[PDB]
Each structure stands twice: as C-alpha cells, then as structure tokens.
From Swiss-Prot, chain C:
Organism, scientific name: Salmonella typhi
Portion of the full sequence shown: 152 to 202 of 553
Subcellular location: Secreted; Bacterial flagellum
Protein family: Belongs to the flagella basal body rod proteins family.
Protein name stated in the entry: Flagellar hook-associated protein 1
Primary gene name: flgK
Curated annotation (Swiss-Prot), chain D:
Family recorded in the similarity comment: Belongs to the flagella basal body rod proteins family.
Cellular localisation: Secreted; Bacterial flagellum
Organism annotation: Salmonella typhi
Protein's recorded name: Flagellar hook-associated protein 1
Gene expressing this chain: flgK
Length: 51, 52, 51, 50, 49, 45, 51
C-alpha cells in the first residue's frame, strides 16, 4: 500500500523536476525568455506595441 | 538613435540571459539524475520485501 | 526594523511550544509513576529514555 | 495616483491591525504548527502507554 | 504468539516509515513541506516570501 | 544583491543537504535489511 | 512550426510516459514474483493436509 504510495511519490517529485527541466529546455533551445501568451502576456502585448 | 534606443528596449522584454538558464538546467539535471536513482533503488529494494 | 519584525513574532510564537512541552511531560510523568509501581518488576525503558 | 494608493493597502496593518495580512498567514501557519507537533507527540506517547 | 509477531512486524513498519520520510525529502529535494516538516520556521519563510 | 541574499537565506530554511540525507538513507536501508533478516530468522524459530 | 504543433498535439493521444509505465512494470513484476510464492507455499500446506 505504502510501497505503492512511496513509489508514486517518487514519481510525483521526479516528474515535477523533469517538468522544470523541460521548461528550462524550452527557453534553452529558443534562446528566448518568452514565446507564448501564457508565459507572461503583458510582455507579449508590450512587444507588439513596441514593434 | 531613436530606433537604437527602442531596439535595446526590445531585448529586455524577450531575450534571456544565457548564464542563468545554463547553470540552472545543469543543476536540475543533476537533481533529476539523483531522484532517478532513488526510484530505481526503492523499487529494487521493495522487491526484497518479498524476495524471500 | 524588519529584522526586529522577524525577531519579535518569532519568539512570541516560540513561547507557546514550551507550555506544550510542560503539559505533555506533566501527563507523561503522571503515567510513569503508575507504570513503575504497577510494573512491579517491569520498567518502561522507552518511557525512561523518551522523557 | 489612486492606483498608487491602492498598492499601499498591502502595506497597511488594517486587517492584522496588530499586524498586517502577511502576518495573518504566517501566524495561522505557526498555530497549526504548534497544534500538529503537540498533538502528534501526545498521540505517540499514549500509543506507547497502551 | 502475538506479542513477538507484533514486535518484529512493527519494527519493520517503523523502519519503513523512517525510510519513507528520508525517501520523501530526498526525492523531492525539499527539507521542509508543512507543519509536520517545520512547525516553526515556515512562518518566517512566508515573511521572506 | 539584496535579492541574492534573500535567495540564499531562503535556502538556509527550506533546502536539504544532499550528503546528510543520502548517508542516512543508505544507513536506514541497512537497518531495514537487518530488521528483515531478524524477522525471517525469528519466524524460522 | 505548425507541423511541429501537430506532432506534439499527436503525442497527447498516443505517447507513453516512460516513468509511469516502467514504475507500473516493476510494480506488477513484483506482484508476479510474489504471487508465484504464495501459490507454492499454499500448495505445500495442501500437501501437508494429507501428509
């Protein structure tokens, strides 16, 4: 039962760490702080007006 | 000159400092590896609970 | 000033815990006497160490 | 300037009047902490007794 | 006979629960989570946040 | 620099020291093995 | 880029998280080994029913 619980836990933690690493990889590959409206929308809109 | 100023303005909104993200993903990769170990260890051990 | 803001509330939260300590040990010691005498040869060695 | 004034509301003590909003959250946290710790330990000790 | 079984089995249980907690902190990477992980300093964590 | 100081001071509270936890982790694993051998022997009676 | 968006959109329907699957795999593997053991011991006890 708790065997299940702890393995699942490990799974939760590892997945969260990977998700962080993957967002890091996003900005890593693109070389951009931002590319999406759901990153930080206000920066996007200010980008359009500044453009 | 007015174009230059706005060009400099643009980057701060959208560009990324490189050192921060690099060091970041390096350290998170190490942590990721360690937790990976821990999964493998814990399940192999859980196998002894019954490897008997 | 902010350092003091931390310090004051931190100690104020600190004190109650020691009252908790005191009442816990009060009841624990209430029981050790019985477990010692009613032990009549036995000894709750854990109650010895834990307190 | 009214927009500027709103922000200062966060700096106000009003709700926590002996404190501010920040300290409401933190003191509630400390309360649950004291409760958790003392009740846990009491439970463990009485389980030992039984 | 019961007492002996309970003694050793609960020994296993508490040894596991200990390891489970060390496992929790190690896998997550956070020493502190909650009133049970930090009834005291987490408040100052809120402040500093 | 203020923010950097805050950032590290937070780690002081929240973070976990890898070395201590891994050491304790291995040691408790050994303790588990000890307890399990104990059980299987005692049940062997 | 739109084709790449399609590709990732495809994943959500068909791609397998390796960690989830492998965790479940070792979990059911342990189950498989243990279950064999229980059958064996129970059948030995049955053999002793006659003895």
């Amino acid at each position: 039962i708790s065997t299940q619980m702890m393995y699942e836990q490990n799974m939760s933690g590892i997945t969260n760490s990977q998700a962080e690493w993957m967002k890091l990889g996003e900005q890593m590959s693109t070389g951009k702080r931002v590319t999406n409206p759901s990153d930080d929308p206000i920066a996007a809109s200010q980008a359009v007006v500044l453009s | 000159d007015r174009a230059l100023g706005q060009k400099l303005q643009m980057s701060n909104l959208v560009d990324v400092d490189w050192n921060s993200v690099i060091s970041s993903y390096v350290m998170q990769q190490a942590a990721l590896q360690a937790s990976y170990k821990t999964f493998t260890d814990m399940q192999g051990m859980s196998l002894f609970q019954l490897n008997r | 000033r902010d350092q003091d803001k931390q310090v004051n509330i931190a100690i104020g939260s600190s004190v109650a815990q020691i009252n908790n300590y005191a009442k816990q040990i009060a009841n624990l010691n209430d029981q050790i006497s019985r477990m010692t005498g009613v032990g009549a040869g036995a000894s709750p060695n854990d109650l010895l160490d834990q307190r | 300037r009214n927009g500027q004034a709103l922000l200062d509301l966060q700096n106000s003590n009003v709700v926590g009047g002996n404190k501010t909003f920040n300290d409401a959250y933190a003191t509630l946290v400390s309360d649950v902490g004291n409760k958790t710790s003392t009740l846990k330990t009491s439970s463990t000790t009485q389980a030992n007794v039984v």
